[PDB]
Amino acid sequence: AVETFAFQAEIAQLMSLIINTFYSNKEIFLRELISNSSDALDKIRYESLTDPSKLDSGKELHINLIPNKQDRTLTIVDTGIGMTKADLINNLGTIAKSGTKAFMEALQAGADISMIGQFGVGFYSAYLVAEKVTVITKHNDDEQYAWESSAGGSFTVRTDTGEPMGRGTKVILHLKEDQTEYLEERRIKEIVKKHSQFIGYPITLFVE
Ligand SMILES: CN(Cc1ccco1)C(=O)c1cc(-c2n[nH]c(=O)n2-c2ccccc2F)c(O)cc1O
Structure with missing residues (x-):
């Protein structure tokens, strides 16, 4: 049921740098x-213009932010296009190679970790605050999968036996003990207002 994979060498190196570099501006x-999530929502919306049946798995296009102080998790849910098994295992890591290599050269040349998004590998900044990341995803052309990594050079993929999601992606950040500020309603609002006022889909913060 569970398969284990090695990350592409350059991605493993980037994750180690993100985990081991002293860097205080973690909110990025x-x-x-x-x-x-917004890009995944644009993709399903675009495909639905030439094939309306793409929305049979769910018409609502939104992002939900779900902090959970008891489990110490921050969950980001979207109803975007989702990812296939091939996306999770090889295809997204393959396209990320040049950006990953360029970002690490930029960091060696004195660049700031906040520039990560300009290199297309922004997802890996989750490891600034998360000891483990679990990703539950469902694409119209494939089954529901659960991807997971605590870094250390590997990740796992399994078919998910949990509640079916219809379509989209759920990212569950298992936060580090000293990073619980990202579970506070006022802190999440401050970040979203500062870094995300040009997203064309409703972002709902779930109150505990
Ligand atoms: C969950 N991850 C990290 C990871 C671990 C394994 C594979 O990816 C993400 O980056 C990520 C991916 C999507 C996604 N669904 N469909 C799709 O095309 N994308 C996508 C969109 C923009 C750039 C890249 C993308 F893939 C999402 O909606 C939210 C996410 O946080």
């Missing part, structure tokens, strides 16, 4: 995840 992770 939320902008990057919301941006990816």
Whole structure:
């Protein structure tokens, strides 16, 4: 049921740098995840213009932010296009290669970690605040999958046996013990207002 994969070497190196570099401006992770969700929503909306049946798995196009102080998790849910098994295992990592290599050269040349998004590898900034990331996804052309990594050079993929989601992606950030400020309603609002006022889909913050 569970398959284990090695990350592409350059991605493993980037994740180690993100985990081991002293860097205080950690809030940039939320902008990057919301941006990816917005891109996934644009993709399904676009495909639905030539094939309306693409929305049979759900018409609502939105992003939900769900902090959970008890489990110490921050969940980002979207009803975008989702990802196939091939996306999770190889295809997204393949397209990220040049950006990953360029970003690491930029960091060696004195660039700031906040520039990560300009290199298309913004997702990995989640490892500034998360000890583990679980991703539950469902694409119209494939089954529901659960991807997971605590970094350390590998990730896993399994078919998800949990509640079916219809379509989209759920990113569950298992936060580090000293990063619980990202579970506070006022902190999430401050970040979203500062880094995300040009997203064309409703972002709803779930109150505990
Ligand atoms: C969950 N991850 C990290 C990861 C671990 C394994 C594979 O990806 C993400 O980056 C991520 C991906 C999507 C997504 N669904 N469909 C699709 O095309 N994308 C996508 C959109 C913009 C850039 C890249 C993308 F893939 C999303 O909606 C939210 C996300 O936070």
